[PDB]
């Protein structure tokens, strides 16, 4: 009688894992892309500073 309740608990918790895996992976990869863009804009400024700081 409560066996089916436990099955529902397990199944409803399991689908949340799948739903959250995509969210975490997408968020982490978007963070990675943002950091890469930050480094791309940073290195150009670094080279400009190499030429800029008292030549």
């Amino acid at each position: 009688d409560k066996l089916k309740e436990a099955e529902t608990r397990a199944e409803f918790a399991e689908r949340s894992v799948t739903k959250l895996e995509k969210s975490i992976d997408d968020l982490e990869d978007e963070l990675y892309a943002q950091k890469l863009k930050y480094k791309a804009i940073s290195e150009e400024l670094d080279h400009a500073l190499n030429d800029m700081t008292s030549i």
Partner: protein, 57 residues
């Protein structure tokens, strides 16, 4: 960035100082030239007066 701002301010400071020096030098050069021209003018008037005096002598 940031150190760019500091370097830019330092260079603007240098430009301010250099332009101020140039302006001061130009003004003094003008003044000295005016003094020299006045001296030459009075020298030639002196020659005129001496010539007139020698004529009358």
């Amino acid at each position: 960035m940031d150190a760019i701002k500091k370097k830019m301010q330092m260079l603007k400071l240098d430009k301010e100082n250099a332009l101020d020096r140039a302006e001061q030098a130009e003004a003094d050069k003008k003044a000295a030239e005016d003094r020299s021209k006045q001296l030459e003018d009075e020298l030639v008037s002196l020659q005129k007066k001496l010539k007139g005096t020698e004529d009358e002598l």
